[PDB]
Amino acid sequence: FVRQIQLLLWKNWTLRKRQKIRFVVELVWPLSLFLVLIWLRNANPLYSHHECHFPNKAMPSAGMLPWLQGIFCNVNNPCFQSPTPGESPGIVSNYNNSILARVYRDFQELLMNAPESQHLGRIWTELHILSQFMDWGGILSDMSPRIQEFIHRPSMQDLLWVTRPLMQNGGPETFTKLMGILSDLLCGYPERTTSFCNALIQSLESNPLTKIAWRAAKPLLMGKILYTPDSPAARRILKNANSTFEELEHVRKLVKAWEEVGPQIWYFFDNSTQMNMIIFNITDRTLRLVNQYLECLVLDKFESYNDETQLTQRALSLLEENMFWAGVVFPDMYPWTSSLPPHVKYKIRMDIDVVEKTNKIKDRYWDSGPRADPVEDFRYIWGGFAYLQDMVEQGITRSQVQAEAPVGIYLQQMPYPCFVDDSFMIILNRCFPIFMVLAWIYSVSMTVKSIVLEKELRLKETLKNQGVSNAVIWCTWFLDSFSIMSMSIFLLTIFIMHGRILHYSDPFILFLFLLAFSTATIMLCFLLSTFFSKASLAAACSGVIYFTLYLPHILCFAWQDRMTAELKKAVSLLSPVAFGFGTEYLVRFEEQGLGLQWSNIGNSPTEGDEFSFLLSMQMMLLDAAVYGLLAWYLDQVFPGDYGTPLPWYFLLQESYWDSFFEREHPGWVPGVCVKNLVKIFEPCGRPAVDRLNITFYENQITAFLGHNGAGKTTTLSILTGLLPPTSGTVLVGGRDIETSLDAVRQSLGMCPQHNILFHHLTVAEHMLFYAQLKGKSQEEAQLEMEAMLEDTGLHHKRNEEAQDLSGGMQRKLSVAIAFVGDAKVVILDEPTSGVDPYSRRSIWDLLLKYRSGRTIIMSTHHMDEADLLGDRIAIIAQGRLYCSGTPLFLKNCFGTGLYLTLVRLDGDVNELMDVVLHHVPQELIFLLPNKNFKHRAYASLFRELEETLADLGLSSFGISDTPLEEIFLKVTEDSGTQLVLQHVQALLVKRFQHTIRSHKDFLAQIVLPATFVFLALMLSIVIPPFGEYPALTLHPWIYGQQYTFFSMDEPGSEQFTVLADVLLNKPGFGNRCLKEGWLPEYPCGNSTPWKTPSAGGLPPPQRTQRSTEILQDLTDRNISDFLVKTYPALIRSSLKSKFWVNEQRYGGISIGGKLPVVPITGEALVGFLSDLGRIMNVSGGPITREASKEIPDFLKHLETEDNIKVWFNNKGWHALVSFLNVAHNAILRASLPKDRSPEEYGITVISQPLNLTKEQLSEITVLTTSVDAVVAICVIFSMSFVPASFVLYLIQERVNKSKHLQFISGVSPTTYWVTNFLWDIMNYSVSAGLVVGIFIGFQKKAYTSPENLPALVALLLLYGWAVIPMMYPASFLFDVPSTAYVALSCANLFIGINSSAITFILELFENNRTLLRFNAVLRKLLIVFPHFCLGRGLIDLALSQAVTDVYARFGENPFHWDLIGKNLFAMVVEGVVYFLLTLLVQRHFFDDDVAEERQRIITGGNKTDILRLHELTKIYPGTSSPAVDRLCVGVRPGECFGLLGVNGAGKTTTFKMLTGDTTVTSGDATVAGKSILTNISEVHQNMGYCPQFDAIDELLTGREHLYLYARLRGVPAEEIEKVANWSIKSLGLTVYADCLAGTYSGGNKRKLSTAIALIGCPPLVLLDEPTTGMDPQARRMLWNVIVSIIREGRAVVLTSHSMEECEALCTRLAIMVKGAFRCMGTIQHLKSKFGDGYIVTMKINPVEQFFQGNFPGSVQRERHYNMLQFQVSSSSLARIFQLLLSHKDSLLIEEYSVTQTTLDQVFVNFAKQQ
Template sequence: FAVSAVIITICTMNSIFQYSDKSVVFTYFFVFGLSAITLSFLITTFFSRAKTAVAVGTLSFLGAYFPYYTVIDATVPMAVKVAASLLSPTAFALGTVNFADYERAHVGLRWSNIWKASSGVNFLVCLLMMVFDAIVYCAIGLYLDKVLPQEYGVQLPWNFFCTLEFWKGKNKKPILDGDNKHSCGEVNEWKNDYSNEATQYFEPTIEAVSLDLKQQENDGRCLQIRKLRKVYKTPKGKCCAVNDLQLSLYENQILALLGHNGAGKSTTISMLVGLLPPSSGDALVFGKNILTDMEKIRKQLGVCPQHDILFPELTVKEHLEIYGILKGIEDDALGVEVHQMINEIGLHDKMNTIVRALSGGMRRKLSLAIALIGNSKVVILDEPTSGMDPYSMRSTWQLIKRFKKGRVILLTTHSMDEADVLGDRIAIMANGSLRCCGSSPFLKHRYGVGYTLTLVKQSPCASAAADIVFRHVPSAALLTDVGSEMSFRLPLASASSFEGLFREIESHIESQCNTTVIEGKNTDIEKNCGIESYGISVTTLEEVFLRVAGSDCVENEPYDSVKDNVDVEVVLEPCFGSADTKVRSTKGDSWLSTKTANKIFSAICSSFVLIFSTFCGVLGLCQTKNHCLVENAETPSFLEHFKALVIKRAICARRDKRTIAFQLLVPALFLFLGLLMLKLKPHPDQVSVTLTTDFFNPLLQSGGGGGPISFNLSLSTAHEVANHVKGGWIQKQKPRTYKFPNAEQAMADATYIAGPQMGPSLLSMSEYLITSLNESYQSRLLCEHSPEVRLLSFMWVDQTILQPSTRNFGRDLDAFSAAIIVNIAFSFIPSSFAVPIVKEREVKAKHQQIISGVSILAYWISTYVWDFISYLLPASLAMFFFYVFGLEQFVGRHNFGPTLFMLLGYGPAVAASTYALTFFFTDYSVAQNVVLLVHFFSGLILMVISFIMGLIRATKHANKFLKNIFRLSPGFCLADGLASLALRRQGMKLGSGEAPLDWNVTGASICYLMLESVIYFVLVMGFDLLPSMPLCWISVRSWCTQRLGNKYYSNLPKGITEPFIAPAVESHASVLEDEDEDVRAERLRVLSGAAKDSIIYLKNLRKVYPGGANQPEKVAVQCLSFSVQEGECFGFLGTNGAGKSSTLSMLSGEGHPTEGTAYIFGKDILSHPKASHQHVGYCPQFDALLELLTVREHLELYARIKGVSKSRFNQVVEDKLTEFDLWPQANKPSCSLSGGNKRKLSVAIAMIGDPPLVFLDEPST
């Protein structure tokens, strides 16, 4: 903030602070900056979400200025002002009073006079209070950061600073022997103790370790997890996420930790790295306890989290340099190690590329490098290869193997191949408990389930193949029979029967080959079993995992209730050790017996049900001949879409209590506090002025006094004082002498001494009275604006006896301040409008709704209506507060209507203008802050500028013109209209009439607000429809690139500029030199028109992304041409960055091709985007989910959007919950789902309504 203080000082040194010491000015702003930073830090301790913290922080900062209105009067005691200065914005505002007084006296604030009070304020006290505030805010913030409950981190007791260990810096030594009393130490003494509760202990299968590894435990050269336990409180009771986990990880080894979604892997990692406090138990990391020595542990800890935590604007090299410095790498060795790590992860050519421009796989490599740099002794890798292509995955495996020497590595993964290749030891968790741990051969031998025989049939209907298998191995079990492939489970004991089985299968295959070469010869069905080929494999690690963890994969899931809409109730009774889930029926018999449930759960694990369900679902779609299932789907109407979207907003609003409170209640609270401060503002009685005819004497004399001449005001000084007195009303008098005890005080008071001396230059009685009474709180006389009215007033004065009359000047000024407060409070409302819109676009949820059938008009109309309804509450509260605080300027008999019209017009106008602003943002938190600032400055600041310009004669004409431009902002319309109502009676809004609805009072504001409500909404529709319009903007695009340049063009919002990327004039569809023959043949087939009957085909589809300042254009998709037939499952493979997601993005309508096109059901995606996408289901690469909707509510939303008939609505939703095994998570919000369950939900959304075409972008990642 020092740089900002220097800039402010330089900018104001010759204008605002012309006479003050520049070091005083710099110190003033610098100290305030320190207090503002510490105040922001204090506010952040109460919040875990950035958007809420920013919004409430801004509101709190502005609210801390309100006490200034109450204590500014000189009659307020200094002790009260010091107390108010505990809020640093108030102390800062009070300091401006001293600056104003001393600058007006041409003296300025200096270090020699900062201790002298003026206007009842002491500048030195303000300065010291801001320093004191900074220290207090920092201390309170550090304390609250330790003791307040946070989403992550270990919470300390409120009195932790009273303990002896805190002051001496000594840690409580953990128990190191084999005793079972591994408590959490002092850190956990204030937590609920669950260790005495009854548990059902499950004895895991553990492979014995060698003596060398045992010696590591004795030497403290390993990671020991000792009865670690984590219990959460849920609405249904306590849920044990990690249950007495006891495990050892050894140096030079990789432990692969496996488990289904929700098994407790991530919770375990969070406790090991200090993000979550354990409920009981502990862990030792090279002899250091995670409860008491976490700061020391983190110095040798490297973590690759499940989701990349990177700085989007930093490069790869800068990331590694920062983390290298944090891990203590010496400066001379930092550069070498950074370059070595960059070469290891294969990102040398991306070394200076910012993270925002990296692909998902590259980001995972960078996260892995951050975990490994600095010679971290303990490395925790949470799914390090997720999102990588097979080539990158294999190279990453080799990298992890090379770096395991001298390290303890904990690896979690859902890839059984990865665990098999990397894991020296493999541990499997289920329901928070350890089930088994050992090497891969040990687990396969211990849990071997036999062999898997796979037969490929000649035709799907061939069934004689199964008879051969059962004849030789009666105990065989049929696993799958899908399409032309079937598989069997063969027990290990049946190995002796394999020879005869294989001979018979091979004989059938050979006889089939011999009979097919004989032309015209028919083969009998009994002799030809239809087997084309076969294969056999032994037990895999995946099968071991399914057998160990499959039977418990969902038992310990905490959820509210399952299958609400059917006659079944699942009751969760948490039992620590092995949580049991009892399934009972509320009507009739049990829907699922325990025996049947065990068979299902033992066969399929939740981690792999996604792949199986997706595969079966796609095959089912392949057999669908119609383009939509008539029995399930109807053509939804606009009202049905509108209803579905409003229900969505209502559910999100009901759950997002913080946002709703911020949108509806906080502005009202802010307004209430501001009006309360104005109400408490003192209004001291002013000296009364008696009006007599003596004032009509053309020469006004004032009293004066004389005394010994000890200080003479020189002529030059007198002229200087006179020149700075406005109005030219100084009477020329004979020189007079005054006695001043202090020369500086004399200069400071010179203006006020000279001020009352008024003489013949006074032009009229009215000017004198207005000037004399400009501070009056009691009366007003002759301040009409128009000459006609003024003339009538003079005639009235001359012919009528003056009668006493009282008019409340101060109330009008308070109403003007209230108008400012209203504008500040209402500036927060539009920022809450922007958040859900930008967030849905950021996570691609809006595109998911559009491609599912929602029209652009339905989307925006539903948003418009919901936001206006929600706006009515703060608007109503504002009117209520105007009544409570007696602001007749707003709610009087003639002013109620105009105020109500402005508030009602402001809501839709500011909502529509906010929607237009959201197209320029891709991050919802940035959008919230910028929208807040835009409406704040375009409303309040412009109103103040206009008000000042209206008072200055030279700028009145310019102000009238600028007002028409300023009124394009809804905030200015509201602020100017309220200010005009407040000051209408005082004549300070020149040109305004008496009627509240006159054009210059509120009429213009009301008309502009109504017009803006329509115009901005039409503009929003244009912005949103522009990308979906036919690409006929080649001339516009060419002009933009030629006139503005590629650099400027690439920085424009993509949502608006995408249509300008029109097909290039020249063709890039020429055959590549290295093009495969099959690819060339497919291209020629498509171009010749032979693929027109395909369900989808691409013709020279090409996508080019604009380059940056130093980067060339990137060709993401190069002239793709292929077709997909109905009933075909088309596999689309490629490395990271090959263009797979870009292609699917264009096919789904999210992106736009640079050249070429594609046809879906015979419709061109460019000229008929809605028609081509109305029967498409889309699962994007990254989950397009609404975090506040539950799994069931997601499916219900898209079922309504896709027009599922009411008669089958509940059945369709429940079928998807069953098919994708999502019943345990049915009533959980998507933000609390694991990554695997989110992918299952995304695929279920794509397939709901049975669309004939489904795009699945890495559905099982």
């Protein structure tokens, strides 16, 4: 048993080591995919970040001016490495770095600080009062140095310098660098309307640079606010909320006041009182234009409503022009209500595009990064959410309390420390499963192909019957595949950790995962090999099934919410799905920085995944187990269409796992018996055999005979178990077949009609392999093999492989294989076919040696051989037995008579018969009676014929005693432009007829990829339906167990004592434990006292409040340092049992802070204005009077002091709003009257967006790009696996030599190639139509646009045009028509993916430096491959469609040269040049009797000779021995020549050289004066070829072949039918004329071959053994047609191995030994020259004594078991015949024959010289 495994692994290694040009690429193919992801590793360094702090965002409650300067200042939210001054505990200004604040400080220091300034102001006021009453300069002079120092201040100096380009000439660069100047002067950082308004709007939207900013700013400026609960309380809230709007209205009315003044200033300047002392023009235009601009702005934004639906329908219309800011809805405070509830809540309806998604609170997968992109991360602030919430909350607070509580609000993000920030993980998470699953599509396909092919060409079944069970071969295949794949993964093992792909994970567990996946893959291979039984089909539908098995992995990527751990496991029964889940968990562990190192196994990577890597491993191993069980079941239930009979599925329910026939003589133990057996083929309808009843015995060498196609191979293969019998007894001696299958398959040799052998194996190894399956060790086989080598004669080719041997050598090797070992039941079939008699007699001697205890059923067609060996002959005619018994009984019961075998331009055939009848009343045979002999008249006639040998011209004769050939013959009786058009139409109809009869191989290699992409598209259609975003309540305890804190800064103020004490204790921290009904799920809790457990300095204290909070005590320290250092420690500590890395920091409120406020004190400026008005007397204006009234309120709302800073983290998507609301509630509760309990008064906010069927334009767009990207390589796979199916027919035509036989006809290579190309492009154009039909049916909007549909159709058609002439050269390289398909499909798919995905990664979703240019370089370089032109074009079309629909959503050419124009108009040239390359590679880079013959051939020669040879030679490379050498024979027309010789001499070699297959090494072959080295198109016009190996399409009938070659020979289309009928009636091919070529017997096949050779009537016919494997009575018809052609005068050359056929036809002879001729004369010349005397044979010791006593001159030649042969000359044959007939009973002679130097004897005498 283990010895069998050792032998099988030995032979597998032996065959593999001969192919170390394909094993290596099989081993290293998966590693070839990982070349892009080493360059991505090297080109994506981990760009580490630096810790940077955030600016303090302002808020409208902090003051209108601070809010505006903030929104203009921190537009980009630039984080700063150093901490900001506003992050200190007490500073909330953070703006003195600006030059405006600096010059204001300089003004406040130089003036209004020294007492001199106050004295000057008082003196000026007194002087003004005195002048007013009337209607010193020393202090003014003393003020001159002060102002001189003021104007010379460096702050003012740089201010004056930078204000030089202050909008000179209307603006130096408009809105290009003026923003920079404004930032310098206000944002000092260390890095229905007027037609004028409409015109400005249209001008600004015209500019695309300013159009993007004018998308959200317009709702912010001229938007509208809708409030549905129009309550009086709501209205007073809004009156307390529009305070900043009122301030803006006042400041807008201020600029309108320059109309009451107008020219009053100019009146003073021109004609006032005391104008004589004794600009305005340049500034007034600016004032008026900014007045107009402020007039254009809309300031009334609140609009009432009553219904939510009305609010939504108005908001939609407003946002159509971007005029809807936000919608505020209060669930409480109904319009009929007018009071303030103690607890008030509102829900802010908003657009989805300007709010974050409510269904999710954070990123699903944690990563590094502060999440601080100003345009998308901070969607609340620039979207107008935080401002609106602040305004409404300030309104409600001022409406509730009456202390007005002036406290500003600022926000400040917690800074992030330095991290890695690698971009490789983003592409890794989306591409790694693909590259890890596509690396396993080539090896599985190759293994499936190898197994199915081995099952196909008769390799598993030929050894299964010998000694091997299916378990043995199955486990050897399993172990071999496991070893190879283990080597593959071991090469893959140390490739990524040393490739720097991973750095933390242990590279040992993934090795186990890879071996589990290897087991899964080999089990899949076993299953798939059991599924198929055809080479082409299995090669085709191999990777498609695997890839569509990987397909549903994308579904879980789409459905990230539906999938659970149980749901993951449920569909994890597929190996690729479990593999992909393992891959994604590995990248999840790697992205966290921990990786899988013997610790993360059994642990979920992200929150409640509840799925383990060990769980995936368990799923994979159980998948392998169930797959193996199913494979075993299917193998033992469905072996396939051909092979062992199929057991039924009930094998597991059982507990156990008339007078012409001779009677049986005694001593005949029945070994094999088959009675009443009938076999029927379903398509034919006529049974092959009907009523077989045989009695084979234990040791008799019984010969099986019958005409070709009767029952022979069927009957001799039905008892070896490889063909299912259709009822019939098969009992072989108590061990019945189909029951004792194992017992009968122990001692049984077998050789089929054809040859079965291992291609990559030598003779010696082939013998040793089968010399050890019977328990024999190495020693027995080694001692045994040499005897077989020396007996079979195959000792000169011991180590000469197996594929260089001809048919006879293969037959000899097969019979030697069946001979070795002990096999009682050998079933040798047809050992004598195309073999020389010299080896045939050796075969006979070997067979009679092994007949003592063996049953032999040897079958043949040489009746002489059967008579010599077979002691019992059974003949089967038309599938039924006709006669049986010993040959003596057969000739007794079927006539016993003598035959005259005289041979015969000389010949009369008119008087020889007359004189013969007078005595006894070129193959003339005369029947003579064996008995009633006169014994003297016969001798008299013999003497007369001897005397009349030459004059009659017969020249030869012989006498035989009843040969079996006559018995067989007796019993077989009763049983031009039009020419090219014709060529192309004939080839087209031939290909069409071939294809229509291959249905299962048409709709499986063509439309299967269409079904694949259809399934992929349908799966991509299935998507999670849109759901409206829920009403998200906003309270910080959503996360639970948070890490808050506070600062208690600036405790001096009594209000600051009031606050930061009611916040900490009573209502928890926000609204939890609020003494009423709110969020009942969260418990109130109990307080925990202070704690100071034992980064920076010391750990500050903390306290656990009643709510789930651990607020800290960072009150007196630097908050920034501790808050930025605790978070790394926090996330490090969070790794304990929480591998999802959840954080606890979520906010923080730092009380205290102050800013410098201008101490105008209100009425001081009003007094200044009144003074200037009463002095200048230019005042007076209703606008002036109404605007000079609210100055104290204007200044009060302008600024606010004593503010708070609200810290926040940014990972949470709602931290800002939640903690801002918490701080606002704390402020409101703090400043409250000391009358009510400050616990039952709070505010809760909800940020539910509008209930609109619209999603965020940042994931659906990415979702659409992904869904067009997941269906972007499926189409590549489909259109990469289609063109490979067109090379199978080409390579199978090349291998079986059918294409060359077509080239023998008058067909130019170009016409054949263009017909093939036209058929391919017509055939290809059923895939493009199908895929575009699927596209239009699914309405793929990326391509179903009418503008792009013709573009897509043209792209597909051109891709098909330029893809066909690329696989044409492959047919000239491969040899097996299933490895070429796999290799080509894999290579095409690999280049397609590695051309498309690289550009997709490099250009989209990535902006590279110094390699982005390389992307353009390769795009200009990679266009040569049509696959790149297809994939890149398709993805670019999809991307362009995405961009167009994005711009259409914002509000808004396929034939382009750079889009598809360069793709299309530079691919047709590629197609035509590749076709020209195909044509180029098609045309290029592809002793005595003979002494007089050679001299006459050279130096002139006969002018009428047809194919005069000249010194033909040939030596195969690597052999150092010429196959043929120096051949020169001239043939006259009308002469039938004979090329006889030993097997392997080179007859086939010479024919294939002279027919144009093999190039001539040296010499010339002058065919009618035309050299073969010259053009052979005209040489092909006068030839007909019948090769030794059949070359025909098995899916056609003979009549189709005849029509095809009649069209190809130039025959007009009206005589085709009549000449076809003439040919079929002259060759007898009429019963099977209209039958398929696949179901043809060997004799039938050769008959068809010679029939197709003779068509067209050329003056030359070439035959390469037309009679090998041909039954008698079929030779005679060939002889008749050949002699008809000869008497027609056209020369014919014939070769054979039967001696009778040549002497019947062939005139001249040429014995070829080792490629060297030995004779040239005709039959009688050789018989007279070579050999002497007469040859007499006898068939039964005393006979030898009689012969030596009567005949002095004789030789005991050919001494065998039961026959004798001699060369007695004597004087005349009459005396020898007389003495033989005298001693008939004395010698016990059974069979005798007398002749004179037969050609077989001289043949074996020539053959024995070696």
